[PDB]
Amino acid sequence: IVGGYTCGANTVPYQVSLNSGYHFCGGSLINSQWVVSAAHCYKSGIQVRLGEDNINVVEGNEQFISASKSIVHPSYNSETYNNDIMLIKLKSAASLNSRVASISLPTSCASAGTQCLISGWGNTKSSGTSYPDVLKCLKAPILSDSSCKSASSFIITSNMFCAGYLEGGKDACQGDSGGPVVCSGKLQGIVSWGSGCAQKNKPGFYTKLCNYVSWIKQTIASN
Numbered sequence: 519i520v521g522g523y524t525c526g527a528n529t530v531p532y533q534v535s536l537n538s539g540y541h542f543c544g545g546s547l548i549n550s551q552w553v554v555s556a557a558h559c560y561k562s563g564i565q566v567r568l569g570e571d572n573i574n575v576v577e578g579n580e581q582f583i584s585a586s587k588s589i590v591h592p593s594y595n596s597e598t599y600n601n602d603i604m605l606i607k608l609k610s611a612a613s614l615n616s617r618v619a620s621i622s623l624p625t626s627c628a629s630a631g632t633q634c635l636i637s638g639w640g641n642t643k644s645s646g647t648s649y650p651d652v653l654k655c656l657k658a659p660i661l662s663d664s665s666c667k668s669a670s671s672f673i674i675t676s677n678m679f680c681a682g683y684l685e686g687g688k689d690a691c692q693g694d695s696g697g698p699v700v701c702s703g704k705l706q707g708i709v710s711w712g713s714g715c716a717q718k719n720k721p722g723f724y725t726k727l728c729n730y731v732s733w734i735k736q737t738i739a740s741n
């Protein structure tokens with residue numbers, strides 16, 4: 519997260535880190551046994567780390583649970599990032615408390631102008647690389663589709679929205695992928711991609727979760 523702020527320990531209790539011997543992506547806890555992340559974050563042997571603040575220090579609110587299933591959307595396109603969504607089943611249920619909690623799925627889509635919270639342990643620099651110890655947060659509005667369509671040579675699919683700041687300096691970045699975009703207490707987005715990070719006229723692009731709710735419920739119910 520570039521241009522964000524330190525969230526505070528466990529203030530985003532649905533935020534998880536996906537770990538393969540190092541943090542590589544975020545995700546969102548949606549019930550005691552299931553995490554939503556990005557399809558482009560898929561790999562074998564993921565360990566889900568819940569209750570994290572400082573990802574480099576054992577502080578005492580962590581639960582580390584192996585993924586038992588990592589399910590990429592069947593229509594994920596790795597070139598366009600269309601349908602950039604993955605469901606992870608935990609090998610055992612997480613123990614839910616104030617610091618480890620699920621986030622609600624949306625009942626409807628959010629409108630342009632809605633303010634959202636984006637979070638993660640991704641790169642905090644727009645030029646070069648710096649990875650934080652603690653969770654970073656960014657308040658960002660959903661933009662109109664014409665501001666994303668004009669804002670990229672790749673035209674935005676109906677399964678994506680963009681959010682953030684056309685002036686530059688405030689955005690998600692590498693290592694934030696798969697993490698949450700929460701608006702009005704509902705999980706509306708998944709950190710998907712962008713052109714660089716926090717560049718002028720190049721907002722962040724997010725998987726539009728409201729389109730996937732029935733798919734998520736069905737996939738969970740069958741697995």
Ligand SMILES: [Ca+2]
Pocket residue numbers: 570571572573574575576577578580
């Ligand atoms: Ca920790």
